[PDB]
C-alpha cells in the first residue's frame, strides 16, 4: 500500500554520464557505445548566448577543443557534429556500461525519470512530465544542462529528454536526443514565454483510481456524465480535453476497481467544482497529473526492471 | 530553480540487492562484502507470522536452506546468524559492486531514499522520512520486504533502514541495518497501532526557506515571535516542539535568505492559524516536512555524489 512519486533505478544511466568542457564552459553529456551527446551550447560563452550562430562558432571548433571526462576516465573526441541542438562527438572507446536503449521523442502527458548532474557526476533522481506546454518542472541549477530524462521497461532505457535552458518563469526547456527541442524553444538567451499550463485530465483520472485502490473513498460521488458534459467542465478549469483513447487507456483500471471511467470523471467534475473542502487525496491538497495510467499500474503491481 | 522531491543516484544500491528464498518464502536482501543482510521472517510462513517464535523457527533451518540469488548470480550460504530481526547469511563471495558504506540508526525528522525492489530486483526509487512515530509513509507491496533506505554523501552509503512490514493503517514499519526496529513494533501480524503523526517543524521551516529561495515570497509576513510563544501554536497543530538546535541547524538558510529564523516561525504561525487561502507554496497546497535543512541546501546548491 501506498503512493508515491517513484523515479526509475537510475544505475544504467549514471554509468553514461560524462563531463563535456570547451573552452571555459562545462556541462553534462551522454557516453552511448562510443558517441557522447551533450547541448550544441557547450560551445558558447554567455555573450554568445545571447544571439549564438552556432554553426559560425563551431568551425572555430576541432576534436581537440572538446574535453570529454567520464570520473577521471579521460576520453578521446575522434570525430563532432551538429545534430539540431545536441552535439554527437565520437571518442576513441565505447563505454562498457552502455545500457540496452532507445531514443524516443515522448508526447505532452507523458512521463519520465531525471538525473539532475553537474560536472558529469550525478546529484539527484526524480520523476516529472513533459507539460502540455512543452515544458517541464524540474529541479535544474546551472551546469544541470545535458542531464537526461528517461523511462525503463525491464532491461531497455528509453532516453527522452536532455536538459538545456531555464526559462524566466522558471520552467525548464528541453530537446529529444535528436537534438530537436519540446515545444517551440530555442538556445538563445532570449524573451521565450512558455504558454497556458494546463492539467493532464487522463493523468488526473490515473491517480484517482490509485487513490480507490490504496483507500481513498471520499471523492466518489452518485453521479455519472459524458465525455461531451465533461469537457466543458474541463474546459473553465484549463484541464486537456478527455478523448476516446483516454477512456481506453484508462480501462485497465476501471476493471480493477469496478468503478466506470465516466464515474470517475463525474467524481472529478464535483472536485473541481467544489474543491477538496479541506480534505486530501493520497497525502495531496490538490489534483496531482503527474501519474501516468502506465505509472499507477506499475506501482500497484510492483513491476520491476 | 525549482523544487523537488530529489532521491539519491540509486546504482550503489542497486548493485547490492539478492533474493533470498528459504521454503516458500522470498523477500529481497542486501549483500554487503561476503554477508547478505535480509529480514528475518524470511524463515517464517505465513501461519507463523501470527506469533512466530524465530529461535526455534531457525533451528530447523541450514545453510543449504538459504537460496540467495544475484541476478543469476547463485551464491553459497557458508554461515548464518540472526541478529535482532535481521537475518546475516555469510556466502562465499564478496560482493564485487560492494560500495564504501556505513550503518546508521537515524533519528526522527531525518529523510532517506528508499529503493523499493521485488524478488531481488529494482522497481523504483523515492525519498522518505522517518515519522516522529517511528513509521515512514512509503510505497510497498507484499514482496518488497528487504528493500533497503539510504543516504549518500559523496562516495560513502549510509544504510538506515530495512523494510519489514505494514500496519493495518497503510503506514509502514523496519529496522537498521542492525536489527533493531524503529519505535515499538515488532515482525509480528499483530495489533500494532502507530501513534500521533506529528509534523516535523524544522523541517516545515526548512521548505519555507527553500520557498524564499525559489521565488514563493507571498507567506511572508510583518510579524516576529519567540520560541515558547511559536511552541504554544506548535502543540494546538500537532507540530514538534521547536529546540535552539533546531533554530541552529536553519542558521546557514537564515543567513542565505536574511530571513531571521524566528520571523519564519511567525509566518508558519498566521499559515497554521489561517491556511494558505487557495494559495500554493513550491507547487503543493499543504505544508511540507520531508525536506530536511540539508536537503534544502543540497537541492539548491547542487552537491554531486
Known sequence: ???????????????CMVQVTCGTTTLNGLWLDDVVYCPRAVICTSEDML?????????RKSNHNFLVQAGNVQLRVIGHSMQNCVLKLKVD?????????KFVRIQPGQTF??????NGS???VYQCAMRP??????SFLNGSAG????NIDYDCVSFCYMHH????????????????????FVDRQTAQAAGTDTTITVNVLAWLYAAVINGDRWFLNRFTTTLNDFNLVAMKYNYEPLTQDHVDILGPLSAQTGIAVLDMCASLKELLQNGMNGRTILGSALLEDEFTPFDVVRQCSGVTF
Open 147 to 150: 542531464s537526461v530524462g528517461f
Open 133 to 138: 506546454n512543452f515544458t517541464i518542472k524540474g
Open 113 to 118: 525519470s531525471v538525473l539532475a548532474c553537474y
Open 122 to 124: 550525478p546529484s539527484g
Open 1 to 15: 500500500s501506498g503512493f508515491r512519486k517513484m523515479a526509475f533505478p537510475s544505475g544504467k544511466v549514471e554509468g
Open 93 to 101: 572507446t565505447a563505454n562498457p556500461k552502455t545500457p540496452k536503449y
Open 165 to 184: 535552458m531555464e526559462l524566466p518563469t522558471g520552467v525548464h526547456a528541453g530537446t529529444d536526443l535528436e537534438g530537436n527541442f519540446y515545444g517551440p
Open 51 to 59: 544571439n549564438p550562430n552556432y554553426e559560425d562558432l563551431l568551425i
